[model samples]
Target: KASSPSSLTYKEMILKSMPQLNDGKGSSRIVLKKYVKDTYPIVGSASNFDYLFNSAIKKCVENGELVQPKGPSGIIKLNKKKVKLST
Candidate 1:
């Protein structure tokens, strides 16, 4: 039997979250943090959810899976890789 999206890879998770949480209409960084915390249980002695959340986001950015608007200091959106299909 299948489980939940929570088990998906970080890449898949972030991508899936794009349309689920907010598509072109980006969400604030704080909201994203809160969402992640609400989704996952507390972990580690530090109890730093932002670290976990930011780590996932950083990986996504490095891999070109997600991005933020230039004008926004707190906005995350999917980095849709527009492909040039052969004619």
Candidate 2:
């Protein structure tokens, strides 16, 4: 059973919610990021799940999944560079 809203399969909803980005460059980045941030401990906890959810939701809204809501708090920015440096 689905325990929470976030527990639902975003991939399914994403297809119906925002089909335009499903087959394009950088389209699924936000969803992937949210999945990682929500499930992986590399840098996540339940307390922060809402943040990740909102970030992904905001992206979906921007991409036309849901109507764009008014607020600056939900946006997420991604950095395209690797953090590790070679010595």
Candidate 3:
């Protein structure tokens, strides 16, 4: 028996792919999703990719890991202060 190699959760992967908001203005959700998808290409059917991604985003925001600049519909940015503490 073998465990799956793809162990990263949606939130973890999202954090790795989330863009830093250095300039105050952040990257759009479209760009963020595209970036993650590009970096880790799905090998399986991946029909739930988009569905799970949305939930992960919601959880990130709820946990104060990501922020939406212009309210519900806008660009997304990283939680710089929290991220800095990790280093």
Candidate 4:
């Protein structure tokens, strides 16, 4: 019975992969871009990134899991206490 290995959302992956999130300093797209490419190689170079990843970023912003930045170069922060509360 695999009870705990439930899949992680792209937003969750972003938050979890970037340890800096724990320090309250959000990761940059540059750093995250490499991570995503490395962790999950692109199937086709035609596409920029995953459908879920892009959508997840937008959703996170709306849900407050990821705070909005001040400007183009502004940093984003993560809610440290955000635990999985929904499906």
Candidate 5:
């Protein structure tokens, strides 16, 4: 068998983390990074973690699914406006 078995894509993993990681206002991008790092063994264990990590955040921001502050290491939170109101 393969050494690592990951069913969720990076995008999906990040997306799934939005609600629980958030508390009222939001949490920082770094926190999300840590969450993924600790929860998903393969992500942080791999050598290309930073590249894959940045790509996921970039796409989410590009699609307007997430929002961040002006500078690096800023707060990262879900875009309330962009998300559909299914709940």
Candidate 6:
């Protein structure tokens, strides 16, 4: 039997993706946008950028698709706890 993977929230996934940009540098938006573009080849069109980016991040996090045991160069651990669903 295989163990279940841990879950994460949208916010948590975004944080994990842009760890270096958390220093109040106002780079999260930019980083996220680029990440979305890179991750999804169909993410074109300026008007849909924000929506697609946010949605992709949330979905990936909720589905445990973005968590890794170790990041490149050992930057951060990917063992994130599950995020509870809210009403």
Scored by TM-score, the top model is 5
Candidate ranking under lDDT, highest first, comes to 5, 3, 1, 4, 6, 2
Question: Could you report the Cα RMSD, in angstroms, for every candidate shown?
Answer: 4.8, 11.8, 6.6, 6.1, 5.6, 11.8
Tens digit per residue, CA lDDT, model 5, 5-82: 365888766666665585414567788778777677888787698688778777877787667665457777766566
All candidates: TM-score: 0.60, 0.31, 0.69, 0.56, 0.72, 0.33
Candidate 4 global lDDT: 0.56
Q: Which stretches of candidate 1 lie over 4 Å from their true place?
A: 1-4, 40-46, 70-72, 82-87
Clashes of 2: 0
Compared with the true structure, what per-residue lDDT tens digits does model 1 show for residues 1-87?
121155555456556656556653566667655554455334212366456666777777666677775533568877756423635
Indicate the residue-level lDDT of 48 in model 6: 68
List of clashing residue pairs for candidate 2? none
Query: What value of lDDT does candidate 1 attain over all alpha carbons?
Result: 0.58
Q: Which residue segments of model 3 deviate by more than 4 Å?
A: 1-6, 20-25, 43-45, 83-87
The clash count of every prediction, one per candidate, is 0, 0, 0, 0, 0, 0
lDDT of 3 by residue, 1-87 (tens): 111234588877666666432343367777766766766577124767877877887888878777775765677777645556575
Clashing pairs in 1: none
Q: At residue 52, what lDDT does model 2 achieve?
A: 56
In model 4, the clashing pairs are: none
Q: Who is ahead in lDDT, 3 or 5?
A: 5
Model 1 CA lDDT for position 12: 65
Give the Cα lDDT of each candidate: 0.58, 0.41, 0.65, 0.56, 0.68, 0.42
Q: Better model by TM-score, 2 or 3?
A: 3
Query: Which should have the higher TM-score, number 4 or number 5?
Result: 5
Error of 6 at 41 (Å): 7.8
